[PDB]
Amino acid sequence: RARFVSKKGNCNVAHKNIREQGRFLQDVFTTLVDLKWPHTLLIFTMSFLCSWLLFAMAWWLIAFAHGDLAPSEGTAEPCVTSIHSFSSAFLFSIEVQVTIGFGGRMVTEECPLAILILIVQNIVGLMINAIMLGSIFMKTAQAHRRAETLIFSKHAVIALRHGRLCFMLRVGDLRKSMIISATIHMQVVRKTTSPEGEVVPLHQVDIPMENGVGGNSIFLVAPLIIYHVIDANSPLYDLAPSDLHHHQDLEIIVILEGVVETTGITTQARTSYLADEILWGQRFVPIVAEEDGRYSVDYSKFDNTVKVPTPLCTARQLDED
Amino acid sequence: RARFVSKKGNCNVAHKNIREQGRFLQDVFTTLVDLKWPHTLLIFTMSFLCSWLLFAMAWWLIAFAHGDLAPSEGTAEPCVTSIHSFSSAFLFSIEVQVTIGFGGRMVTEECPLAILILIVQNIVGLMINAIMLGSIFMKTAQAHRRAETLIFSKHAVIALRHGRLCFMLRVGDLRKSMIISATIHMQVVRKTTSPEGEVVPLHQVDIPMENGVGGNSIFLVAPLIIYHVIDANSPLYDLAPSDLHHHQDLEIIVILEGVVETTGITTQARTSYLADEILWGQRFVPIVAEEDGRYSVDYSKFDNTVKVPTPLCTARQLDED
Amino acid sequence: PWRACAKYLSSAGILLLSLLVFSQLLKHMVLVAIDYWLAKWTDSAQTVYAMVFTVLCSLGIVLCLVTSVTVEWTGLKVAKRLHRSLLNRIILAPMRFFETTPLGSILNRFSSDCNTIDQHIPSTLECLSRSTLLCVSALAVISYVTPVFLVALLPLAIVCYFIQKYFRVASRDLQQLDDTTQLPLLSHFAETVEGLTTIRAFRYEARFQQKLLEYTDSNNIASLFLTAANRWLEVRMEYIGACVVLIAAVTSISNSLHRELSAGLVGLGLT
Amino acid sequence: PLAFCGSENHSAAYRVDQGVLNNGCFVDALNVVPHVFLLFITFPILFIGWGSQSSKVHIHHSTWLHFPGHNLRWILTFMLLFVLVCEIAEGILSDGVTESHHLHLYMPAGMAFMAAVTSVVYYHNIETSNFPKLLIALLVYWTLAFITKTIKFVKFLDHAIGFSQLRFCLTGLLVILYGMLLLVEVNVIRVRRYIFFDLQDLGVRFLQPFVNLLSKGTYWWMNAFIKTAHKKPIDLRAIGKLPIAMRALTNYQRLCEAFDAQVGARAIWQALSHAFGRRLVLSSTFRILADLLGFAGPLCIFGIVDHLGKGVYFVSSQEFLANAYVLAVLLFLALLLQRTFLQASYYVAIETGINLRGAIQTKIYNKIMHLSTSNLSMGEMTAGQICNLVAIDTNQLMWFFFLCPNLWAMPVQIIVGVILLYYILGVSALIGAAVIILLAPVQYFVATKLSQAQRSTLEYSNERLKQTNEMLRGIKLLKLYAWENIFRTRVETTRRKEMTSLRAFAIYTSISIFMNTAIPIAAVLITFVGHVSFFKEADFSPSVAFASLSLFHILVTPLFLLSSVVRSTVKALVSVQKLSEFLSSAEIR
């Protein structure tokens, strides 16, 4: 009833009562990139406004400690020119840290403390610039968003091929980009017991994808049929056609790995298939046509499938003719 | 008594009397990123203050060579306006290199040497900016800190499954992030001799992880049981239950590889297991529950294990019924 | 609003309940009249006031005296009249009732509940009647002196009622939990004292000590959680009881500083 | 134009002219910087550890561990919030004669208040996460705030303005407070040495004796249980098991280890006192820490209606206490903490009463395990008497321990009451308050009368209850012999013996309640006629009138419970007499 991963690719886990939070604290960076978009915007503006206001308060404290905030002056230079308010010191800290430098507010060589605070402000300004801009580019450049453009079938199918019952599904690209070294991991996740009484709630046992060599690696240009033949040692060996219903302890997850050709950064697309999502005795229609010296593929009829005369029993009894 | 790698993941090696230091010198970059945090902060501020002070001394030497440091002036322009101290030249070099440009100290077209030194200062300022900011972002973006969020069991267990003695341990994630193409390497490191008298102190022989296909690659969402069955050619084939004690020449290291889903940069988590850390005749409790249309996992009881009736002898004699 | 208080007051008698309400309500009226006469008297600018103060004081003395004797007399009447009817009703019963109903329950009634209606209902009746009418009279006169008090009186009343409704289900549940863990400990005592000879014959002393340890652990932790419940509800209610003094002080000081209040009515409302 | 330090004339107070750290707004500006340092360090750390975790992920079920000095840090934090809101009030009343919004009196104290609440929230978050590798931010914050507070204080003393101005005594309390915070900080350094050198929570759902002190006061852990109360009702499952100190057999390890060291009812008394006197004096010291906070009611009333009956720039302390808004706020905070301390005293008294019951029931069971059946067969005790002893007498001991610290703190409350009565009203307060010491020996008189009434009543109730037990057991004989009318007649004879004792008991209790009420109102009549007549007319204001009336009310408000208390202690006295009788009975050799 409750699926493991969604049809969209979202894992329905909870992670309740995690004990150690110090290991969460000891990497702030992965927690920093792994945020929502308004939280990342908020911490971006929070870090920059915090640094600007802190150095604003520092510059205003320096301009107060030298006493040039009092306009009763002689002829001596202030440590920062034309600062006579906290807001003017804030604007000066703005011009310093983001390196605008209008020059109406500028630093004279009177205060050496002003020189020192300008040095540390420039150092941590360059540091916060490197951190925040690299972090926001890594945030916008992660490739889980690329997995939104790799479609799957709503329904995985089981039919006959080469005398054997195989488990087929279709997966295609939506770009003329590539998924470099696109691997396939197909795992059967269900509750099973050991013969020795060991009970495990989600035993992620993985069927091998039938490739031709055995290395699970595909070439996704056209939406090809990926398929796993049901062997005797396969965990689908005793699957009934009547088993494909709701409230059936069976889930097939298909994990497409690879790296995006454009960004060069890697990714992973995932999808699920429940028992009442699997059609028995059906096969996919051909969706690739060839004309005008090219090849055409109709993604509008990507998911369609036809009925096929198929033996209505498990792959175990198929081996007895 | 002395473990090879720690329980935390730290290798207890020494690397004594390394001869060639020129190969250390011929890559300064990996030594630059592989520093402690205060050393990286120190070399950051050292490089920027060194460049600023060097060009400060250059600008002050130019303003002294043109003689405009002497305030006895006619009407001719200085090569830099309003410089009359070394500290003012330092502030000018500050405005040049980090590109603030207040303009009270600015360059006139009188000295061509000032134009040339401004050109080389801007060039190596852009160069040092690229080097130091990319280096500090690669320092904060390396993913050995991600390995702090991948937990393991304190105790690996040995029990029965499918009539065979298997070697099990549990490893889980603490985020809703992913480890893309998460591979497992399990190596038995111990001192063994050849039959021909070859003695080796740490023979890293690796057991294969029992997967179902044979490709050591997992799907870490829930904390799953990874386990290696003890085959006849396995190096654990003649392991006694009484062998699991202190001062026993046996260590099991578990190396989880993969790439972080968020950053896209790769990583490796590692852990160890000594002989007196391995429990015989025990198996892990199920820690995954299913409710509210989702799945729940209790990491507070992640490490707990129960007693199991198990034959108290080695896997060799188990093959004689 | 249960039928039990209706049976209680019907056993009390109409004369006694009318004397109860007359004594208690006029007692709170004479006390509130004595502070009102003090507030009208202390702003001087003989014996225009402050001599009916004396007869008012002695009237309050004898009126709380008759309040005390009517609460003790209703206590004695419900002691005499809840007994001698239960006893005559139980003694005229078929033994089908005795063979069905456990005798321990009936004797627990005849001990514990008569003990409550003897030694606890007059004291709790007094401390309910002395508290609640003092509270509502003081609310009435902080309404009189400060006319703006009602618009903040309704928020405190509605949050009092809603925290009470938030708490009442937990209080009922945990109180019933304390009673159903109160039962098996006493029945374990009653069955140990009878079969003491058998339990010393069997050499089964340590396990029954363990069983009483488990029973007393369960009973003590249920009474501990009921204690924590009552203290949590009381500390929230007393936080509201501090906020009402805050709002009374701030409205009396806003309506004394730029108004007319004559500096005694504010002391009345604050007291 | 809002301005730090204000814009009074020519911004002349911005000048450094006489030296650095010589301007008052300058040492206020130095006072600003540790607070904003603390906020700007804490808020990213508090963000990244907690709240950064998403909606599905939930942390940290149980088994925290408190740092040493945690009680002292929380108490010092609460008085820090009190002195900082007093500083905020001083900032508001300062800029009443001057215009143009001197922000140096508000914003240092405001950022100090924000730093205080964020420091205690950060301390709570690092406490339940038990990571002492952090909190050096709190150490450097307390040093920085302490240094700038010493700077401001010695510059107050350098200008020689003090002890009548609120800022001076305020800053002195704040700097000794920050010194105590640095002391508890280095105490966290000293023991639990982490920088420069657990308690069992397996199945327990109580959590009360090991939690932070605010939620010890407010019982905030049970907010989750009352949240789950509007769900499935609560069971003995998910009520948890017992904490080890409040486990049974642990008390009664304490009680037998007090008994063997005791080497008799009076011996039982003194060894019970040795067993539970620590928790009992903690109960009563919460009780006397309360009701002196209660002795700020009448002082606040006298202050507000005493005002209502009428060195650059400063608020004097007398004019600060002349202002009645802050006296009302002080009264609100005082009543808040007073009710909190009274509730805490109630809780720990009931906890040691529960522990007393849990010990002595096990002791009764140990005596009944070795009791010879000859005592049961020949007379002196029945099974009904033994279960009566448990199910009534143990609760009588428990209720006496519920109401013990009240009678311990009664004399202290009334003596501070009569001394504060002498603080106003002059000598006529004593001639108005001598009626209470006149009616104090008749409390002993009615205590003796109540005592003999209860002594008769317990014996008669034992008689009637065992008679009812044998009648209800032998119902079958009784009805088939038709003897129930004469047996009910014998039961009504014992019931007449009940009612003839309960009638005198009720009459004497009504005598004591008549003694309990109207003696304070007689006291105010006596002192008010004897103040306006036969005495010199010495300031019969509304002020001392309502202060004296509220003081008499708060004096007699703990008097009105005493009848139930004396009934409880006489029931406990005859209870422990019967207890020492049963515990001294025959045995099995």
Curated annotation (Swiss-Prot), chain C:
State where the protein is found. Cell membrane
Q: Where are the transmembrane segments?
A: 18-35, 53-69, 129-146, 148-160, 235-250
> Domain ABC transmembrane type-1: where?
17-271
The record gives the effect of mutating residue 200 to Q as:
In HHF1; severe
Cytoplasmic face of the membrane:
70-128, 161-234
Membrane side Extracellular: which residues? Answer: 147, 251-266
**What disease has this protein been linked to?**
Leucine-induced hypoglycemia: Rare cause of hypoglycemia and is described as a condition in which symptomatic hypoglycemia is provoked by high protein feedings. Hypoglycemia is also elicited by administration of oral or intravenous infusions of a single amino acid, leucine. Hyperinsulinemic hypoglycemia, familial, 1: A form of hyperinsulinemic hypoglycemia, a clinically and genetically heterogeneous disorder characterized by inappropriate insulin secretion from the pancreatic beta-cells in the presence of low blood glucose levels. HHF1 is the most common cause of persistent hypoglycemia in infancy. Unless early and aggressive intervention is undertaken, brain damage from recurrent episodes of hypoglycemia may occur. HHF1 inheritance can be autosomal dominant or autosomal recessive.
Subunit details for this protein? Forms an heterooctamer with KCNJ11; four ABCC8/SUR1 molecules interact with one KCNJ11 homotetramer.
Sum up the protein's function in the record's words.
Regulator subunit of pancreatic ATP-sensitive potassium channel (KATP), playing a major role in the regulation of insulin release. In pancreatic cells, it forms KATP channels with KCNJ11; KCNJ11 forms the channel pore while ABCC8 is required for activation and regulation.
- What family is this? Belongs to the ABC transporter superfamily. ABCC family. Conjugate transporter (TC 3.A.1.208) subfamily.
For this entry, the protein name equals: ATP-binding cassette sub-family C member 8
The protein's organism comes out as Homo sapiens (Human)
UniProtKB/Swiss-Prot annotation, chain D:
Name the consequence of residue 131 to L.
In PNDM3; pathogenic; reduces the sensitivity of the K(ATP) channel to inhibition by MgATP; increases whole-cell K(ATP) current
Q: Which locations, inside or outside the cell, does it occupy?
A: Cell membrane
What S-S linkages are listed for this chain? 5-25
Outcome following mutation: residue 218 to I: In PNDM3; uncertain significance; affects channel function resulting in increased potassium currents at physiological MgATP concentrations
Q: Which residues form the ABC transmembrane type-1 domain?
A: 280-571
Q: What is the effect of changing residue 71 to S?
A: In PNDM3; uncertain significance
Membrane-crossing residue ranges in chain numbering? 30-46, 72-88, 106-122, 136-152, 169-185, 285-300, 326-341, 408-423, 430-442, 511-526, 546-561
Recorded consequence of changing residue 85 to G: In PNDM3; likely pathogenic
Q: Which residues are glycosylated?
A: 9
Per the UniProt topology annotation, the Cytoplasmic ranges are 47-71, 123-135, 186-284, 342-407, 443-510
> Topological domains (Extracellular): residue ranges?
1-29, 89-105, 153-168, 301-325, 424-429, 527-545
**What's the stated role of this polypeptide?**
Regulator subunit of pancreatic ATP-sensitive potassium channel (KATP), playing a major role in the regulation of insulin release. In pancreatic cells, it forms KATP channels with KCNJ11; KCNJ11 forms the channel pore while ABCC8 is required for activation and regulation.
Subunit field text: Forms an heterooctamer with KCNJ11; four ABCC8/SUR1 molecules interact with one KCNJ11 homotetramer.
Which family does the record claim for this protein?
A: Belongs to the ABC transporter superfamily. ABCC family. Conjugate transporter (TC 3.A.1.208) subfamily.
Q: Which disease is it linked to?
A: Leucine-induced hypoglycemia: Rare cause of hypoglycemia and is described as a condition in which symptomatic hypoglycemia is provoked by high protein feedings. Hypoglycemia is also elicited by administration of oral or intravenous infusions of a single amino acid, leucine.
UniProt protein name:
ATP-binding cassette sub-family C member 8
Species assigned in the record = Homo sapiens (Human)
